[PDB]
Design a protein around this ligand. Structure first.
Ligand code: ANP
Ligand code: MG
Lengths: 441, 29, 350, 223
């Protein structure tokens, strides 16, 4: 309540909503903490840090805006609730429960409110298409991110990417993290989902400089300390935005993680810069403060400014698969990469099989067609049927692995990388056989 | 098992259920 | 018609390559039958009898494989096809080592280097393979070193004019001619889903069904040579006969190019045409009688199926005998020697 | 009329394209090239639909679209790997008489990069492999020109050599890597240099193979 009053002191029109909003926040937080516990999923940890992140998100969304209606404040409240609570959830029923109870809490604590404006099914926020972090519709976001993916094909990696709904949602989540104060992300999910790809794509898209640790045979803690020195020197002194991406190839060493937690929490690593290193850090911090326009002279104030710059400049992106301390879970904003849904598989198939012919004008649509994509157009075309069959093949591998596990045999995981491999193989084989027959003809 | 792999699960389930039935649940100190 | 059929054929073949490979022979066949049933249910045209080995390979490559140490089995031919048309670096799970020797023989001209994960000099060799562009076969993958994750995932960063890959603490210049074959000799091994995503599995393990099929094929080859020849003709009719027919067509066109006076010097050139026609008729006959020969070979195979099941059961009893006593170590080659003794040099059969 | 107006606009677009083509290859920036090509595409799309139906406008639009498509090959060609020798390979196999100093983006654009994707990709793969070899040789030269023997005082009598394990590991690693280079498919230009380094490496190895031995014995013997 004190924090919300301080936050809403910016907008005199919403001061009377400081007390109710806080209550709503508290209630929802409590509800989630009762509903989701660490016994189900190890990352279902809730603490006052999530509430501080909620307040910080609402503060960052409200700071540049001159005025808001009450519906806008409730909408950003719901948006931050979704980004902090629903994102970590693994199963679908939990996400549905969270989405309904956000509405329930908002109506309970904010009566006489137009819920249509304060709650549309695709609650969406981004300042990519404007100057301020305003709500934005789904279609223009999809168009803008498709254009940026087309750009990202030339610069950096050349392998194609498909922008389906889950990918775009995760892109928006990672962008929100990259625009938060000390916003650190933990992409937890299945292998091959696209965690590294999307993290790097959003980091490039927002201009962040991707830095990754290169551990080796007997990696020394002194080497990790030097890497941290370089990263914080660039983030704080040089005013450079850095996406500090870490993967399980080096996250598995918890000795570095427990030292990373200090930077994740406070935004500084005391004892990292000492002696000569501390003197050079103070010199460069003085130079940077003068360049920005601050004549801070005392070493303590310079260190405070450096810590603030690291808070506002350095973002750490952890990438892991479903050991890790709950403190690390609670320091980072949790995002879940599930296995690609049927719609995602269908979209990937249609995009990656678009250069193929896959068009029979005399295709007779079968009665009672076996359909795996519920939203598949009826009546389907030949290409639609082919992509449906591809999705069915992936689903049959999943069912086969489930049956083998039930019988007691050893099974391997079918990641979305298997589906991408299958579609690439289909393209190569189709083109090869067509070329062979055409030259024969 | 290793001689013929395919029946073993159901038999083991029944055997373990019977063993749980015979073996007393708790022993008092 | 083959235009009409290629879409379904390639869908099934690509699914087989990408998805099957860890499963046993019956499980691959079940997956293929499920996919074929779905494609038929959706009126997606495909050939009813997809011979995967002959669709995804030609006679020249199969003969070259047989020149190498690739056993002439359906499972091994399918596994070699997966080892050929792979987009992800394969993980070989042979328990015997024939597949590793096959890989070494195939890439001997490319200077393939055999390394192990247990070797302390592994990483260094890997760096060389990454930098100088040489095939590398790394064994003992059950102790997989996660440092290979960027290499298997092909995560490259194109800084400057040099393409890099992060191996350990060092950024190695990836070479276009690099290929790595992971391998293991442990059939009962579990891999993390990360590695499962970065590699494609190629299982050479001999199971009950694989050995049953091997024994059935050997019975058919030994005791019913005519039925074995007819079955081989079915497999060859999936393109090999047409391949040689079109090769003779090309030869006839080449001979018909040189036509100036010598076309009617004897006016008996028609012989070559007759030859093609004859073979055409032959293959046409083999096309017309395909269903009858399929039924015949299936009945003959059902005749010797119980013997094949008996052979599989006998071998797996032999293999499991090691639990009774440590001396009871009997290899598959030992059972095959027993079985060839029973088949060929059996004085009772005389 | 409408035809005269579309001819004038076509001439303007052709002049812009020519100004783009006259840019020398040395200063061609592929990113800004893509941005300006997109700007020209937007200029083309701004024309009225009646003028867009003309065949010449469609030809120029698809030509600019193909230029945008081969822009990726433009980034790939404007690399440090391509050197002069690989440019000479493109010179020979494309059968065009270019001048490297006088090379401009227009000459490369006139050559059908889309039709010659196989040639360019093969040359670029050769460049990638050979640049990998060249940078490994650069690493060898750097390390073996800046590497110093570690000396530690020994009972105020002499400065003995410490760090035998590190030095031997480095020498063995470099010898093995040069031997592997000798098996590389791109080991044609870097042959002689590699040979020379191999010789030096062997000598280094050989020398220290006796040096440590002598040192050890001497230490023991003085004790
Ligand atoms: N939306 C997408 N469309 C197409 N390909 C994609 C997409 N997302 C990811 N990929 C592909 O996924 C492959 C590798 O997956 P990656 O992005 O490394 O997933 P990850 O979650 O980092 N896997 P891991 O590190 O093993 O947990 C790449 O070749 C990407 O091209
Ligand atoms: Mg990753």
């Amino acid at each position: 309540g004190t924090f919300n009053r301080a936050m809403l002191r910016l907008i005199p029109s919403l001061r009377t909503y400081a007390e109710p909003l806080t209550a709503a926040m508290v209630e929802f937080y409590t509800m989630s903490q009762e509903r989701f516990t660490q016994d189900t999923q190890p990352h279902y940890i809730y603490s006052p840090r999530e509430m501080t992140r909620w307040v910080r998100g609402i503060f960052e969304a409200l700071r540049p805006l001159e005025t808001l209606p009450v519906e806008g404040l409730i909408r950003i409240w719901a948006h931050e609730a979704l980004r902090l609570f629903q994102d970590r959830l693994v199963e679908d029923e939990e996400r549905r429960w969270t989405d309904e109870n956000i509405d329930t809490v908002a109506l309970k604590h904010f009566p006489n409110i137009d819920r249509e404006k304060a709650m549309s099914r695709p609650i969406l926020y981004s300042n990519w298409l404007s100057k301020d972090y305003i709500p934005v519709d789904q279609e223009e976001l999809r168009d803008y991110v498709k254009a940026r993916l087309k750009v990202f094909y030339e610069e950096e990696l050349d392998v194609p990417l498909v922008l389906f709904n889950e990918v775009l949602d995760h892109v928006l989540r990672i962008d929100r993290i990259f625009r938060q104060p000390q916003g650190h992300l933990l992409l937890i999910g299945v292998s091959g989902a696209g965690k590294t790809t999307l993290s790097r794509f959003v980091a490039w898209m927002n201009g962040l400089s991707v830095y990754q640790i290169k551990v080796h045979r007997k990696y020394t803690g002194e080497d990790f300390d030097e890497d941290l020195r370089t990263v914080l020197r660039r983030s704080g002194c040089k005013n450079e935005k850095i996406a500090f991406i870490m993967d399980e190839s080096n996250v598995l060493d918890s000795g570095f993680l427990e030292r990373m937690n200090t930077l994740l929490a406070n935004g500084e690593v005391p004892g990292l810069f000492e002696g000569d290193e501390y003197a050079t850090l103070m010199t460069q911090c003085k130079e940077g403060a003068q360049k920005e326009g601050l004549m801070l002279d005392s070493h303590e104030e310079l260190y405070k400014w450096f810590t603030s710059q690291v808070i506002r400049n350095l973002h750490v992106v952890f990438t892991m698969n479903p050991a890790t301390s709950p403190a690390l879970f609670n320091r980072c904003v949790l995002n879940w990469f599930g296995d690609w849904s049927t719609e995602a598989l269908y979209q990937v198939g249609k995009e990656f099989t678009s250069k193929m012919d896959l068009e029979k004008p005399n295709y007779i649509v079968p009665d009672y067609m076996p359909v795996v994509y519920d939203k598949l157009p009826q009546p389907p075309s030949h290409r639609e049927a082919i992509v449906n069959s591809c999705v069915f093949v992936h689903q049959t591998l999943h069912q086969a692995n489930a049956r083998l596990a039930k019988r007691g045999g050893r099974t391997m995981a079918i990641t979305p990388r298997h589906y991408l491999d299958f579609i690439n193989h289909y393209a190569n084989l189709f083109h090869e056989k067509r070329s062979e027959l055409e030259e024969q003809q | 098992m290793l001689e013929d792999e395919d029946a073993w699960m159901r038999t083991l389930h029944t055997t373990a259920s019977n063993w749980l039935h015979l073996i007393p649940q708790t022993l008092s100190h | 018609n083959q235009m009409s059929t290629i879409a379904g054929d390639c869908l099934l073949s690509a699914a087989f390559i990408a998805y099957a490979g860890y499963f046993d022979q019956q499980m691959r066949q079940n997956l293929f039958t499920t996919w074929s049933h779905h494609l038929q249910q959706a009126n997606i045209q495909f050939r009813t009898d997809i011979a995967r080995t002959e669709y995804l390979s030609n006679a020249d490559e199969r003969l070259r494989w047989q020149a190498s140490s690739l056993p002439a089995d359906d499972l091994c031919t399918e596994n070699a096809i997966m080892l050929k048309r792979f987009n992800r670096y394969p993980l070989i799970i042979d328990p015997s080592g024939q597949a590793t020797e096959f890989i070494m023989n195939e890439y001997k001209d490319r200077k393939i280097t055999r390394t192990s994960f247990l070797d302390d000099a592994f990483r260094k060799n890997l760096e060389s393979a990454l930098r100088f562009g040489n095939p590398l076969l790394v064994q003992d993958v059950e102790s997989y070193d996660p440092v290979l994750n960027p290499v298997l995932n092909r995560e490259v960063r194109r800084t400057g004019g040099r393409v890099l890959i992060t191996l350990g603490d060092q950024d190695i210049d990836l070479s276009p001619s690099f290929v790595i074959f992971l391998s293991t000799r442990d059939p009962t091994v579990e891999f993390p889903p990360d590695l499962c995503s970065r590699v494609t599995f190629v299982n050479f393990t001999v199971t009950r069904s694989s050995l049953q099929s091997q024994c059935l094929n050997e019975v058919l080859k030994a005791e019913r040579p005519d039925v074995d020849e007819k079955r081989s003709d079915l497999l060859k009719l999936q393109g090999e006969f047409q391949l040689r027919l079109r090769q003779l067509e090309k030869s006839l066109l080449q001979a018909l190019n040189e036509v100036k006076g010598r076309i009617l010097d004897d006016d008996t050139i028609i012989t070559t045409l007759e030859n093609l026609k004859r073979e055409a008729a032959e293959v046409t006959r083999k096309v017309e009688e395909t269903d009858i020969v399929m039924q015949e070979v299936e009945t003959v195979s059902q005749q010797y199926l119980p013997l094949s099941t008996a052979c599989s059961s006998i071998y797996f009893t032999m293999e499991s005998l090691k639990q009774i006593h440590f001396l009871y170590q009997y290899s598959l080659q030992f059972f095959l020697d027993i079985y060839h003794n029973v088949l060929y040099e059996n004085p009772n059969l005389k | 009329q409408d035809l005269k107006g579309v001819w004038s606009e076509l001439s303007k677009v052709w002049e812009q394209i020519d100004q783009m083509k006259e840019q020398p290859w040395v200063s061609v920036q592929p990113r800004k090239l893509r941005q300006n090509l997109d700007a020209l595409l937007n200029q083309l799309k701004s024309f009225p639909a009646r003028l867009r139906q003309y065949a010449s406008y469609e030809f120029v639009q698809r030509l600019l679209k193909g230029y945008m498509k081969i822009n990726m090959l433009v980034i790939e060609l404007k690399s440090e790997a391509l050197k002069d020798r690989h440019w000479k390979q493109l010179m020979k196999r494309l059968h065009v008489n270019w001048v490297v100093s006088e090379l401009t983006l227009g000459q490369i654009w006139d050559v059908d990069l889309q039709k010659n994707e196989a040639i360019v990709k093969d040359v670029l793969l050769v460049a990638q492999g050979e640049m990998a070899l060249e940078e490994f040789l650069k690493q060898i030269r750097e390390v073996w020109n800046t590497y110093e023997l570690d000396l530690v005082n020994y009972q105020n009598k002499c400065r003995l050599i410490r760090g035998w394990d590190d030095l031997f590991n480095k020498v063995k690693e470099h010898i093995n890597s040069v031997s592997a280079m000798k098996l590389s498919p791109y080991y044609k230009v870097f042959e002689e240099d590699a040979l020379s380094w191999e010789d030096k490496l062997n000598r280094i190895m050989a020398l220290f193979d006796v040096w440590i031995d002598v040192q050890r014995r001497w230490v023991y013997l003085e004790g």
